[PDB]
Each structure stands twice: as structure tokens, then as C-alpha cells.
């Protein structure tokens, strides 16, 4: 919990805080996304040291992969808003307003399903 | 973005190949990793070329 799961959850939340920075702050949003993706990459690399070379994904691999998906989707959200703010100038800010709540909600439901699964398994 | 991706590629090269003996010839993942490195390096070089085409 303290070695892998809290680092992953903190990284996933650390990606989503960038949604409160203004859309025009390109370098800041970019560095949030990149650094959190690197955090997830190194977490994935280190987690493999705890086991032999098993040839199938474990539960912690599922959790790490889903958190990685949330991180990379957070980066993709900034990429999309940065594209549309230039290409079709705006209402594009509703992308930020939606993601800013949707990502936390979806990650929360992911946890409510995952832990509800493996504590009863 | 590009420099950080280059950094990550150079980082993972060692963290992967450290599990293999120090043979001189290339493996499958050596070809794959250098191919991906070429793509990442070109992704970085593209913006420098974009600056050179712009400021000229």
C-alpha cells in the first residue's frame, strides 16, 4: 500500500491538478504531464523487481496500468485543448471544465470497483 | 518533451540490458530500442529544424 499504491494514486491525482492551470500556460501543463508519465514509468519498472519473471499480469499490474492510462489521458487532454485553442478559436474551455471533474470521478469509481473486487476474492 | 523522452530512453536501456551478459552482438530488443531511439531523436530534431526554418 505505502510502497506502490499510494505512489500511484498520488501520481494520478498529481496529473489532474494541472487542469486548474490556465490553458495558455503551455510549459507548465507540459511538464506536469511529462513528469507524471515518467513517474508512472519508473513505478512500473520498479514494481517488477518484487517478483520472479512471471509471464502473466498480476493484480498490481492491472492497477498500475489503469493509473498509467489516467495519467496518459491527462496528458492527451492538454494536447487536445492546446490543439483546438489554436485551430478553432472559446467554448473549448468546457473541455477543461469537464475533465476537471470527470477524471477524479472515474478514478474514484475505478478504485471502488478494484478494491471491492480483490478484498472479496 | 523531446529531451525528457530522450532521457527516459537512455535510462531504460541500462535498466533492461543489465539482466543480460555483456555479449558484443545485437539482440532483438537492441534493434527495437535503437529504432525507437531513432524515432524519439528525430521527434526532438524536428523542432530544432522548425526553429531553423522559422528564424531564417
Swiss-Prot record, chain A:
Residues 49-58 are extracellular. The chain crosses the membrane at residues 1-21, 27-48, 59-80, 98-118. Changing residue 34 to F: In DEE79; decreased subcellular localization to the cell membrane resulting in altered protein localization to the synapse and altered gamma-aminobutyric acid signaling pathway. Changing residue 34 to L: In DEE79; increased affinity to GABA; decreased maximal GABA-evoked current density. Residues 22-26 are cytoplasmic. It is found in: Postsynaptic cell membrane; Cell membrane. It comes from the Eukaryota. Alpha subunit of the heteropentameric ligand-gated chloride channel gated by gamma-aminobutyric acid (GABA), a major inhibitory neurotransmitter in the brain. GABA-gated chloride channels, also named GABA(A) receptors (GABAAR), consist of five subunits arranged around a central pore and contain GABA active binding site(s) located at the alpha and beta subunit interface(s). When activated by GABA, GABAARs selectively allow the flow of chloride anions across the cell membrane down their electrochemical gradient. Belongs to the ligand-gated ion channel (TC 1.A.9) family. Gamma-aminobutyric acid receptor (TC 1.A.9.5) subfamily. GABRA5 sub-subfamily. It is linked to Developmental and epileptic encephalopathy 79: A form of epileptic encephalopathy, a heterogeneous group of severe early-onset epilepsies characterized by refractory seizures, neurodevelopmental impairment, and poor prognosis. Development is normal prior to seizure onset, after which cognitive and motor delays become apparent. DEE79 is an autosomal dominant form characterized by onset of refractory seizures in the first months of life. Brain imaging may show hypomyelination, cerebral atrophy and thinning of the corpus callosum. Heteropentamer, formed by a combination of alpha (GABRA1-6), beta (GABRB1-3), gamma (GABRG1-3), delta (GABRD), epsilon (GABRE), rho (GABRR1-3), pi (GABRP) and theta (GABRQ) chains, each subunit exhibiting distinct physiological and pharmacological properties. GABAARs subunits share a common topological structure: a peptide sequence made up of a long extracellular N-terminal, four transmembrane domains, intracellular or cytoplasmic domain located between the third and the fourth transmembrane domains. This is Gamma-aminobutyric acid receptor subunit alpha-5. It comes from Homo sapiens (Human).
From Swiss-Prot, chain B:
It is found in: Postsynaptic cell membrane; Cell membrane; Cytoplasmic vesicle membrane. Changing residue 16 to H: In DEE43; uncertain significance. It comes from the Eukaryota. Residues 16-27 are extracellular. The chain crosses the membrane at residues 1-15, 28-51. Heteropentamer, formed by a combination of alpha (GABRA1-6), beta (GABRB1-3), gamma (GABRG1-3), delta (GABRD), epsilon (GABRE), rho (GABRR1-3), pi (GABRP) and theta (GABRQ) chains, each subunit exhibiting distinct physiological and pharmacological properties. Can form functional homopentamers (in vitro). Interacts with UBQLN1. May interact with KIF21B. Identified in a complex of 720 kDa composed of LHFPL4, NLGN2, GABRA1, GABRB2, GABRG2 and GABRB3. Interacts with LHFPL4. Interacts with GIT1; this interaction is required for synaptic GABRB3 surface stability and inhibitory synapse strength. Belongs to the ligand-gated ion channel (TC 1.A.9) family. Gamma-aminobutyric acid receptor (TC 1.A.9.5) subfamily. GABRB3 sub-subfamily. GABAARs subunits share a common topological structure: a peptide sequence made up of a long extracellular N-terminal, four transmembrane domains, intracellular or cytoplasmic domain located between the third and the fourth transmembrane domains. Beta subunit of the heteropentameric ligand-gated chloride channel gated by gamma-aminobutyric acid (GABA), a major inhibitory neurotransmitter in the brain. GABA-gated chloride channels, also named GABA(A) receptors (GABAAR), consist of five subunits arranged around a central pore and contain GABA active binding site(s) located at the alpha and beta subunit interface(s). GABAARs containing beta-3/GABRB3 subunit are found at both synaptic and extrasynaptic sites. It is linked to Epilepsy, childhood absence 5: A subtype of idiopathic generalized epilepsy characterized by an onset at age 6-7 years, frequent absence seizures (several per day) and bilateral, synchronous, symmetric 3-Hz spike waves on EEG. Tonic-clonic seizures often develop in adolescence. Absence seizures may either remit or persist into adulthood. This is Gamma-aminobutyric acid receptor subunit beta-3. It comes from Homo sapiens (Human). The chain holds residues 278 to 332 of 473 of the full protein.
Amino acid at each position: 500500500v505505502i510502497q506502490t499504491y499510494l505512489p500511484c494514486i498520488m501520481t494520478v491525482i498529481l496529473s489532474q491538478v494541472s487542469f486548474w492551470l490556465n490553458r495558455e500556460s503551455v510549459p507548465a501543463r507540459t511538464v506536469f504531464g511529462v513528469t507524471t508519465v515518467l513517474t508512472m514509468t519508473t513505478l512500473s519498472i520498479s514494481a517488477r523487481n518484487s517478483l520472479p519473471k512471471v509471464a502473466y499480469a498480476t493484480a498490481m499490474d492491472w492497477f498500475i496500468a489503469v493509473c498509467y492510462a489516467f495519467v496518459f489521458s491527462a496528458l492527451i487532454e492538454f494536447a487536445t485543448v492546446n490543439y483546438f485553442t489554436k485551430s478553432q478559436p472559446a467554448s473549448i474551455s468546457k473541455i477543461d471544465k469537464m475533465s476537471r471533474i470527470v477524471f477524479p470521478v472515474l478514478f474514484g469509481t475505478f478504485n471502488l470497483v478494484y478494491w471491492a473486487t480483490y478484498l472479496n476474492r | 518533451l523531446g529531451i525528457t523522452t530522450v532521457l527516459t530512453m537512455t535510462t531504460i536501456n541500462t535498466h533492461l540490458r543489465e539482466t543480460l551478459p555483456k555479449i558484443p552482438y545485437v539482440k532483438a530488443i537492441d534493434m527495437y530500442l535503437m529504432g525507437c531511439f531513432v524515432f524519439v531523436f528525430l521527434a526532438l530534431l524536428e523542432y530544432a529544424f522548425v526553429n531553423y526554418i522559422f528564424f531564417s
